[PDB]
Amino acid sequence: GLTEEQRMMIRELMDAQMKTFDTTFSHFKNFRLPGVKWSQVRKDLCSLKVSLQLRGEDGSVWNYKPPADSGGKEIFSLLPHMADMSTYMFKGIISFAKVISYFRDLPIEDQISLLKGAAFELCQLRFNTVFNAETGTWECGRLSYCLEDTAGGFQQLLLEPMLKFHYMLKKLQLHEEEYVLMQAISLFSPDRPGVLQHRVVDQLQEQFAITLKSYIECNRPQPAHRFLFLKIMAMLTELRSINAQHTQRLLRIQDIHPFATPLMQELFGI
Ligand SMILES: CCOP(=O)(OCC)C(=Cc1cc(C(C)(C)C)c(O)c(C(C)(C)C)c1)P(=O)(OCC)OCC
Numbered sequence: 078g079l080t081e082e083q084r085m086m087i088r089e090l091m092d093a094q095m096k097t098f099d100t101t102f103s104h105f106k107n108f109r110l111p112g113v114k115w116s117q118v119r120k121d122l123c124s125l126k127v128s129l130q131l132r133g134e135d136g137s138v139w140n141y142k143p144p145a146d147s148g149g150k151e152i153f154s155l156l157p158h159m160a161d162m163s164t165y166m167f168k169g170i171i172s173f174a175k176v177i178s179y180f181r182d183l184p185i186e187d188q189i190s191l192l193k194g195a196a197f198e199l200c201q202l203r204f205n206t207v208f209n210a211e212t213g214t215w216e217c218g219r220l221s222y223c224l225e226d227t228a229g230g231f232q233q234l235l236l237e238p239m240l241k242f243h244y245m246l247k248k249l250q251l252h253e254e255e256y257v258l259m260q261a262i263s264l265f266s267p268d269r270p271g272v273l274q275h276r277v278v279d280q281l282q283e284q285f286a287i288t289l290k291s292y293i294e295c296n297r298p299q300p301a302h303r304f305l306f307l308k309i310m311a312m313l314t315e316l317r318s319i320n321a322q323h324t325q326r327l328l329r330i331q332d333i334h335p336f337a338t339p340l341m342q343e344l345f346g347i
Pocket of ligand 1: 125156159160222327
């Protein structure tokens with residue numbers, strides 16, 4: 078059964094989510110848009126295969142299809158825009174953290190540390206909920222990011238760790254509570270550099286995992302939801318690896334083509 082404390086914990090997480098997650102992206106506006114030798118690795122954007130769509134309020138539609146590489150010069154046509162969306166997302170994620178309580182009790186520096194450590198993951202997790210595995214696109218309000226699938230690579234070429242992550246996580250068909258919980262576990266990761274009260278955060282993370290584990294055992298009795306809790310935990314360990322992988326990828330690009338926003342600079346190196 079689920080205890081009173083567990084219940085209050087979920088509600089606090091759920092309350093924090095609806096207060097800070099603008100699922101319609103209504104306040105995402107005034108964002109940039111693509112214009113109208115060891116950089117070969119800097120070509121990490123090889124799987125940045127996303128067409129862009131914008132549903133005009135008046136009913137119109139703008140559709141953007143990206144260029145090609147082998148024209149190494151300027152394949153960052155989509156970076157600025159992308160960075161703005163990340164900032165909007167991050168802002169939302171920081172608001173999520175600061176609105177909990179177990180988080181605000183932690184000393185300031187510990188909040189900063191945990192945030193710089195989980196930003197990517199928390200934002201990555203939120204985007205999964207607006208991801209559509211059918212059309213391979215991320216519905217973000219009037220905005221849309223369609224994967225250049227059945228066009229660019231091939232629907233089996235999910236060799237890209239992150240895409241595999243989104244399809245795989247979407248496949249579990251998690252509930253909102255589960256998403257918020259695995260957003261808590263990620264946020265309160267005791268093993269993130271610079272963490273002071275690591276003993277506290279660690280125990281907090283255990284209470285979250287225990288709650289999620291409980292929730293699953295108390296609301297998903299069917300054979301297909303066996304080991305769900307572990308898959309999710311493994312799923313989150315994977316996410317950490319991508320995170321690190323990404324910070325690096327992102328920094329290489331920054332080292333030769335500045336584009337990161339002030340906020341992005343805060344969270345990461347710069
Ligand atoms: C068009 C990008 O599609 P996408 O799915 O990855 C494709 C390989 C994607 C990944 C992503 C996520 C982040 C956060 C989570 C840390 C904010 C980024 O900062 C960045 C870049 C590298 C652009 C700086 C990319 P998304 O956040 O796009 C943001 C504009 O969308 C996730 C659904």
